[PDB]
Design a protein around this ligand. Sequence first.
Ligand SMILES: Nc1ncnc2c1ncn2[C@@H]1O[C@H](COP(=O)(O)OP(=O)(O)OP(=O)(O)O)[C@@H](O)[C@H]1O
Ligand SMILES: Nc1ncnc2c1ncn2[C@@H]1O[C@H](COP(=O)(O)OP(=O)(O)O)[C@@H](O)[C@H]1O
Ligand SMILES: Nc1ncnc2c1ncn2[C@@H]1O[C@H](COP(=O)(O)OP(=O)(O)O)[C@@H](O)[C@H]1O
Ligand SMILES: [Mg+2]
Ligand SMILES: [Mg+2]
Lengths: 1622, 144, 193
Amino acid sequence: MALEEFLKQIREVWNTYELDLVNYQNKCRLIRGWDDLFNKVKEHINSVSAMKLSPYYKVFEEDALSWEDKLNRIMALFDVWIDVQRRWVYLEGIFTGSADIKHLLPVETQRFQSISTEFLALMKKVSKSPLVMDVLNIQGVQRSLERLADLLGKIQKALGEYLERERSSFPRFYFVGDEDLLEIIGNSKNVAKLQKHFKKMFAGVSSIILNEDNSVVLGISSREGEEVMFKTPVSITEHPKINEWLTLVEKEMRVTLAKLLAESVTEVEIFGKATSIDPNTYITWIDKYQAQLVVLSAQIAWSENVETALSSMGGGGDAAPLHSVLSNVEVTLNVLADSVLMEQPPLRRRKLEHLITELVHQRDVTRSLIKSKIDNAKSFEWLSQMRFYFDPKQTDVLQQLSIQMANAKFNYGFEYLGVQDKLVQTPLTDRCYLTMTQALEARLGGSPFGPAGTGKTESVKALGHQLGRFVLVFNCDETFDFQAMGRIFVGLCQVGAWGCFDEFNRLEERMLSAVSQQVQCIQEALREHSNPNYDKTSAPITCELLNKQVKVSPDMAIFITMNPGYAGRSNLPDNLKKLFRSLAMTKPDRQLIAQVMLYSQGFRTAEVLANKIVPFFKLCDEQLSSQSHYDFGLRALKSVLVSAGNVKRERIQKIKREKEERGEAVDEGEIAENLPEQEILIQSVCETMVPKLVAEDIPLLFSLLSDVFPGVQYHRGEMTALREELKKVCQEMYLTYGDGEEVGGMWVEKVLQLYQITQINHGLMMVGPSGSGKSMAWRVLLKALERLEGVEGVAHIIDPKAISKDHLYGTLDPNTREWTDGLFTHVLRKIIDSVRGELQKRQWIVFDGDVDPEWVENLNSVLDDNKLLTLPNGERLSLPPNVRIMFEVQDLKYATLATVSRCGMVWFSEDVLSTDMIFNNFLARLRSIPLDESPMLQIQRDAATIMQPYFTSNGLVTKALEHAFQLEHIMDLTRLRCLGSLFSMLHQACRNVAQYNANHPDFPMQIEQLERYIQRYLVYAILWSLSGDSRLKMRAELGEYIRRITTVPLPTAPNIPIIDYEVSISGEWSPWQAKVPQIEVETHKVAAPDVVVPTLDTVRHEALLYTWLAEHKPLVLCGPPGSGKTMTLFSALRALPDMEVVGLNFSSATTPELLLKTFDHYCEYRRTPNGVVLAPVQLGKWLVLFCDEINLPDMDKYGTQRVISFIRQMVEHGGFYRTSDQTWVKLERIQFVGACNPPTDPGRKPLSHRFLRHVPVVYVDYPGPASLTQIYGTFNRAMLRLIPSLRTYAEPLTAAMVEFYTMSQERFTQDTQPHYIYSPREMTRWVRGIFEALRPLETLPVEGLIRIWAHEALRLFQDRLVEDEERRWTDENIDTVALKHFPNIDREKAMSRPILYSNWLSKDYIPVDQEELRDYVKARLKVFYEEELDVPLVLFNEVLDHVLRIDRIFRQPQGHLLLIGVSGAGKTTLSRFVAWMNGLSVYQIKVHRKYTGEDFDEDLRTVLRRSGCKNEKIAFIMDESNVLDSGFLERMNTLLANGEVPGLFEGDEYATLMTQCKEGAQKEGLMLDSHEELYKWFTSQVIRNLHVVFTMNPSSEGLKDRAATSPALFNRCVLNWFGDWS
Amino acid sequence: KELKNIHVCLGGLFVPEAYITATRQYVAQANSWSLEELCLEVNVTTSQGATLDACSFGVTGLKLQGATCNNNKLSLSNAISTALPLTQLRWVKQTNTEKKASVVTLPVYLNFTRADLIFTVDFEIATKEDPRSFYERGVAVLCT
Amino acid sequence: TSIAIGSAEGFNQADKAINTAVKSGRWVMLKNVHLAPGWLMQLEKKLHSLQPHACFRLFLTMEINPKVPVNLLRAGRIFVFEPPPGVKANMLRTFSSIPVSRICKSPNERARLYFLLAWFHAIIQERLRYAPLGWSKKYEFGESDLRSACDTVDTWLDDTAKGRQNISPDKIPWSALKTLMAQSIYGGRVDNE
Ligand SMILES: Nc1ncnc2c1ncn2[C@@H]1O[C@H](COP(=O)(O)OP(=O)(O)OP(=O)(O)O)[C@@H](O)[C@H]1O
Ligand SMILES: Nc1ncnc2c1ncn2[C@@H]1O[C@H](COP(=O)(O)OP(=O)(O)O)[C@@H](O)[C@H]1O
Ligand SMILES: Nc1ncnc2c1ncn2[C@@H]1O[C@H](COP(=O)(O)OP(=O)(O)O)[C@@H](O)[C@H]1O
Ligand SMILES: [Mg+2]
Ligand SMILES: [Mg+2]
């Protein structure tokens, strides 16, 4: 019924809604009403979303899909049309308005003319049919717009040279971005769209005032709405050029302000020299004139009064008329104080506060003059003060006012500053003014330095605003190179504006030195401008900047504020420090700041409050614990003071309102007198200071508050209306809610505290341990505020450390000087533009990642009072009032005080999110969300009821979790890693029951059987989720503790641990040993790569991995190298047919690019209406990314791993950011599996706790002697079946192999040498080596078998040894082991002193004699001389041994060599000789001085093509000297392990490769077609054909360094220690 | 109660500035005074003969550099350091009676590096010693 | 021609300046050359195979950085600049740097003011050798402060003594000199009360 109504409303709306077209300069009819069209599509899509949810959707399923497809095409097409229309409009005006562009850019005009004619043609077509349906169905209109946008994009970039030409005409254009400048130039005819670009060009002018015709500029306006009326308005008709009439506006702005100031000065002289002042007259004068003129007029009047008084006191006995000046100031101050106490308009209230702040300073100075007995106007006690002199007789209005301080003379620039937050004139600020003005007089710069929050940036700006100068703030960083700073200096010099380069020392040291040349020549030009010999008739003064003559305006100045010893900063060169006059701003006068600020806000007890709040802040700093997120400086005090003014204002309004309901009485005096000013200050302190406090610091601060403010109590206002919104939102998100002391009570207070911080600060931090309820706090509040206030909330979650700083903020091209927007810049610029109504929504930018000064200090100006984002290209982006920059971090260890002081911290302790809160969330999701996508839900609900008693506080799970923290694990234990693994494993129990029900349709599972299964599985689940990453005895230890505390039935075995038992689907404990049979491996699969002998450890881990993998949950296998992590994972993946694994080998140089290259090769990006989706190319199969060295990638100096942060983002948020176009890509059907050695191993860094939370860890230990005997006893029995006579010796052979391996592992450890790693991999290679030797032998005496056994032991355990005594020990112990396990054998026939095997002298692999081998090698060397290399060689015993070792490796698949020895030992010559003997083709990279990474890639491709496509065996010989970059090793690391490089072949190279793999497959006889199996065949061929020989010197630190940079060099290459000639 | 009558070495404390606040906070709470109104006065005691009087807090280990304290009067000395036997920190209400023209404010640094300042004491000059001479000679007090 | 080393195009200017100077015979100064030790190797090689003009002089300014190439130090002549050993040496360099005409101006009392400035500079700069006692930290009391203080004396003395050959010592602006030095010239670097 209503379903049909929805379909009808959609149909009648869309067949009647016509696009809105209006005439545009009698050229075409553009489309308006964008908001109406967009929201209508969105609201109709939402109706289509609700179409599907209803049960009656079945019959209406077909019609809804047709409508949604229509809506998406309408949404997608008009989303592009709005873009192309805007680009066309301003591009057309540029090409049409200016006729000079016809010649400079002829080809570019021709391209746009064709585009415009095509665009105008489409305007005619859409004008004929204004209906939305008709225009949508235009043939190829969607494609026609994508090319239109691309064509408009290409023409847009080419106008960069034209823009730089136009910036010279109006110098203020230098601080406008390229795109915004295009809009200003193009839209010169339509001035109405320029009103959003004036704020980037003027200090306080936000918009201009125009008449009805919009052809005459009547005046200017500020952001607050303050307006200045031009005396002679500027008419645009007579000056059509955009730069021509903009210049006249600026010139008229200064003259009008000067004329208005002269009138204001004339009026204010009446108030001066007056004993009594009328409040009505004074208020009228304040309202009449601008905020900057009212304060300036007061300053002029006071300066003239003191000058007159001091001149009158020339005799010294003139009865001190200075008392009259002090009396007048106090009388006027009394009137201002009275006016503030009553309600005033917001603009007049700001004017009164500015007047109070200045008149307090004027009163203080006059008292100092009175106290010091100053009777001369030339006394330095008066000369050091800032004095304003007005000359009404001056013909030029711009020169009427003169500002003087000490011996420095200044002129007011009359720049319209609007209404700015004026600073309190503290004695430190007076010292700052004196030093900075002295620097200006000497034509030097000012360099105030000190700790963060002392007020250096504001003081420099305040002085500039005091002189009426245009002050520009730049947030300097390391990308402010010579060209960027030179262009900024060019703009400042021409404009005549002050440049405050905050954080100047954040530049590179080399770049600071380079900039010193530009500052030096600029100051030299300024210095010679002040010479009295200079004449304005001559050429204007110029300086050589960027190889160009630049005129230097006298009003320009350079100021640099820096923190000397903060992290992330550089040291200024000495030649640069002499160009600046430094001042130490270390201790702000916060006592006077508090007093004046509270006095101007209307507080009656400001002096008492200031004397109580400033010491309170000092005591808090000196008493509270030293926390990384604590800041009790001036910014914290300033935030409290401004909150106190806001709290008082709203409290007064509430009191005034309350009297309305009660009756009729409004008395400002009674309200002001009866106001709890003590409670107001405490409320602001508690609303700002409590959230950041740790649990143990809260009582200390409240005790301090009680002592400082005795008898005053604070009761927080109950935000009731928000609490129901939180309660409703929490219920929908399965989140526990609590009030006060209830469960979840602490979490809700944190949410409310975070809400208050959002209202006060525009920059937030959520500091707290991993899994402390931070993300849920702001997610719930954002949704709750959306419901409560009706404003849509949009969050842009960004990981700053998952991408490089260039991709986060943007980069400037060194050659073309074109700015490319980064991730954060694009997000912020998109909101500022508000093309799609982004400014009407609550926008939150959440930085979910680590904070370090490298990237976070670029937001110093954003989080400051500037609320500005400054880029190296001179562009500034004002932070909109609706945007909050929010940080979600776990610590602030590496963040400097510059950023901690800029944000309001909210501390989320781990006790905020109690354990039972997580338990309730798990059970709520279990009872509501089906696991399949209901019989499955019914199983979940029944299982949840059984698990309810255990998932309670002080229950089984909580007690077990507490005990598991005492035990140590292979990785640091976190609560949510255990719970996250436990919850994912209990879901598999529900799936197991559902599978059982499907398997038994007639008899489904009953409740009693369900209770038995779930109760037993939960105990099984707790054991493997809590002790899964711990050694065997603590898997046991957690077992008895559970046995001691649980009531669930447990196995009755006296000694078998519970970890050895599984839970059958029938509901009974069954041993894991029942699934471990004594299998018999086939002879031809002995020690095969994929053959796994099932043992107790293998079956337990395979089931555990399958449980986690079936949930598509990330996991990490941790354990010693060679323990069996990869083997266990691949064995478990064989049970999942819909999962394909892709191997990734991490190294110390691993970056997210390695993952991105894999995504490009194995996945594809597809556009969907919900966004971009990254899914594997093959349909229906889940991609598993196996990262083999996940903890190897290097931590930077701030303790983070970029690849790990990339994965952590891409696991938690299910996607990442594509830096190509700054779009969010969402993963689909992609899984991650990691493997790593324990973090205590050398070169391994512990993983972040914010990453380990999402990832369960399983510990795979080395097999024990019993396990090794079973594993390799099976291999030996199957291998020895080749010779039936030797089958009796299978058991002693396995015992000897295990015994020798055990002793060799113990004797040689990583402490001695880095490569002394002995694992079961050597045993597997031991079995293979014996198998290959016996395979051919038809018969062999027991002595022959032992000789082969010893030879394999020598080649596996002795070749890597370094010292001679270690080799001697190995030789001796092999003899003892063979005799111990094989008695009564011919020792001489078996344990002969030289043991050599070679297939060179026969068809088989039989032992060879040294003398006969030497003759054969001598004969073959003679032939080798003439054919390949005529270098004579000398054959001694070691050479014969070494050539045999190299020959053995060259005959193996994927046989790589690592030859370590001193240079000149023959490592390369022997490698070439053996390769020639074995038929391999030797390849060496011809490295030279200009060799780079691209050359190595070409060489790598050449070898792979020869060895993969042409089936040519290649001995790729590489030396350590050939490695000129870390990139060479990273490519080699992947090639050695996987046999392939994912990103090596791209574009034409990939296409050329695929043809060559296809033709090569034809020769082999396989007609492979698809690219997937062509690459798989190519990878298989490279594996079997490419041998890499790596030669390096026996360095000590170099070998350890290579063990981390290229881990595959020690795991895939057979290491031989050639050393030096003995 | 004994925690008030124990002599503590400021050098041996992890944070000595928190102890000064704690003694300040104790006196204000006991006498029902406000925290900001309190001022600190120093009284170096020969040995430990003097007794604490509900506002004094004995401090040991203070080292005087370049001066000698006799009867709570300073005199310039050629010795590198002079050990103060027992320093009594008495918290008293502010009386704003101005300086005595023979009282110099000595910084009290934590260690010899003179990098961090704990608090400041107002000692008294003996005889005819110039207060400017104390400033020039870098006379200060070291916690350890 | 003075070039500050550290920029990519700074090396281009340095090479062009040296190529032109070796023919014309002018002087070339390259500052902060310790920031490009790799380019210093090439500069040493270029200088060795060169036959410059008789009057050509190349000045390299560094920081006594252990990354400066050894072969550059051997080829060139090293001049080390550091605080003078004592007060007497501090006075001598202070008086030598100031031109004789600057001290000998219209007021005969300018010479005594410069001497007092020379003595005050010598005392405070020598106190830096005793880091905990002389000051609280290693302040950068250098030649830039002395230049600013000398400019302050010249400006204020000219303002009071407007061409007078002699000025009474009482009329000398002691308050201006004392306050400006304590707040701006020398007291700017001071951060301790
Ligand atoms: N109020 C709540 N009630 C119930 N469960 C909650 C509540 N808040 C959080 N949780 C759950 O507890 C866990 C905490 O996750 P959350 O995202 O809030 O942590 P976090 O502090 O942001 O962690 P991280 O530092 O890893 O980003 C999640 O499993 C979440 O579902
Ligand atoms: N139960 C088992 N059955 C057969 N081989 C085993 C067993 N346990 C260990 N191995 C041997 O141990 C080696 C494990 O190496 P691998 O798993 O590749 O190390 P890593 O997991 O560190 O990459 C394999 O070569 C395998 O032959
Ligand atoms: N066994 C040997 N007898 C004689 N000369 C040798 C022998 N081994 C190496 N050389 C000499 O070493 C030189 C080649 O050294 P090379 O093998 O490239 O050093 P590296 O092994 O460090 O790469 C040849 O010129 C050869 O004369
Ligand atoms: Mg700043
Ligand atoms: Mg989070």
